[PDB]
């Protein structure tokens, strides 16, 4: 079932050519012939990718977005019994007494 003598010879000849082609694909030492600390690198990254953008965004939000109505809408703060209101000084009454069942 093996190769015929004619086939084996052709496989032999292609093989020498292929292995030579593959050998020629290797790069010479001079090729390619090109034409002519962590803290610091993380410090420069934070400066250019956080501080400068957040400067731009804060300036954008403070003097352009927030000068228009309803551009930034906050859920109003939760008020709990006993809280004191900073704006007025109003004191919210405590809840009525519990049955204190435990």
């Amino acid at each position: 079932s093996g190769y015929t003598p004619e086939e084996k010879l052709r496989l032999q000849q292609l093989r020498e050519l292929r292995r030579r082609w593959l050998k020629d694909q290797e790069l010479s030492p001079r090729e390619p012939v090109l034409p002519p600390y962590k803290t610091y690198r993380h410090s420069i990254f934070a400066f250019t990718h956080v501080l400068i953008p957040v400067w731009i965004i804060h300036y954008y939000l403070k003097y352009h977005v927030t000068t228009k109505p309803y551009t930034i809408v906050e859920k109003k703060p939760r008020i709990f019994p006993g809280d004191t209101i900073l704006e007025t000084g109003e004191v919210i009454p405590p809840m009525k007494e519990f049955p204190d069942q435990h």
Binding site: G2, Y3, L11, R15, R18, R19, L22
Partner: protein
């Protein structure tokens, strides 16, 4: 993955055949025909090819496999498929 070499492929092809109980490890050589010299049949040759596939982790199609009749032929077939040139 570590690269293959012609010497490396040959070593493992022979290595596998030395662990087959139907071959004589001393009488084995790269040029031993599996039937004419080693006196195996074709059912045995299918198993040898099956073991080579398991050894190198790739499949030899039956059309190609039935022609690999000595260890050197297997070494050549594997080298051609894997672009091994040394």
């Amino acid at each position: 993955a570590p690269p293959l070499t012609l010497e490396g492929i040959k070593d493992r092809v022979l290595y596998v055949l030395k662990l087959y109980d139907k071959i004589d490890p001393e009488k084995l050589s790269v040029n031993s025909h599996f039937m004419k010299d080693l006196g195996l049949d074709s059912l045995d040759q299918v198993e040898i090819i099956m073991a080579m596939e398991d050894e190198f982790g790739f499949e030899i199609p039956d059309i190609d496999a039935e022609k690999l009749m000595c260890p050197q032929e297997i070494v050549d077939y594997i080298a051609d498929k894997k672009d091994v040139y040394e």
